[PDB]
Target: Carbonic anhydrase 2
Amino acid sequence: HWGYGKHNGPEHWHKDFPIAKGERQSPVDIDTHTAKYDPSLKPLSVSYDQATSLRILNNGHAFNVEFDDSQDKAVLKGGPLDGTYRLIQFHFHWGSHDGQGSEHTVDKKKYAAELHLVHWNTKYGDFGKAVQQPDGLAVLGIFLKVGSAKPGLQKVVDVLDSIKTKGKSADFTNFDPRGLLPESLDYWTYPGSLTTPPLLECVTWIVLKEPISVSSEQVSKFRKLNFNGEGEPEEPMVDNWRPAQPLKQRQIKASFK
Ligand SMILES: [Cl-]
Ligand SMILES: [Zn+2]
Model:
């Protein structure tokens, strides 16, 4: 089974998932000098007022906050997207220390972590059908940098102690993901893939320019989670990120100059 270790980590995924060497893999390094301004890209429309969070789960790879995606007003649209995409879950990737942990990089700079807000294209009926199409999902990626604390993240970080091992979960209602967004919605966009197996090339990536600031203590709580199930010897959940992949024949566009 895949993981992030020496023997089952990202360098090994291609054996079970040959698309790992595909033409539209994620993440990627974003070169700010070559990314091209496209002043025809509409503002991003992020509507989370009626986002209805359900639970938080340690899935053995990261933790996912799951949403009720029948909420037809809880949607991402605009920007580079046609039609409407529904929020299903968000999760993070992070490092064994503050100097690494993001999946996308910006001019080769890695951030302490990266948040992914996963949405599926309503035109395909559900998430399971959408992942089989090239315009099936839209993932909103947001970098975390160490600085002042992020108040809207605190409810997430405080609940992690009770879901420390694989399989554990907690009810997690009335979490408002708007508390995780930076001031600015300027972004870079490119077509790419899920960054975990099955690595399907079904994602329009929308990566915000502006990181959110989280405190050193908040991010260190991510690192207290464990990959293993209860009753195995603790295996700290850190460095669950996939490194930058070849950009091949893709152009990264920017919503801003
Ligand atoms: Cl804290
Ligand atoms: Zn992710």
Remarks:
- The two ends are 43 Å apart (CA to CA).
- The first strand starts at residue 29 and ends at 30.
- The helical segments are 13-16, 127-130, 154-159, 216-222.
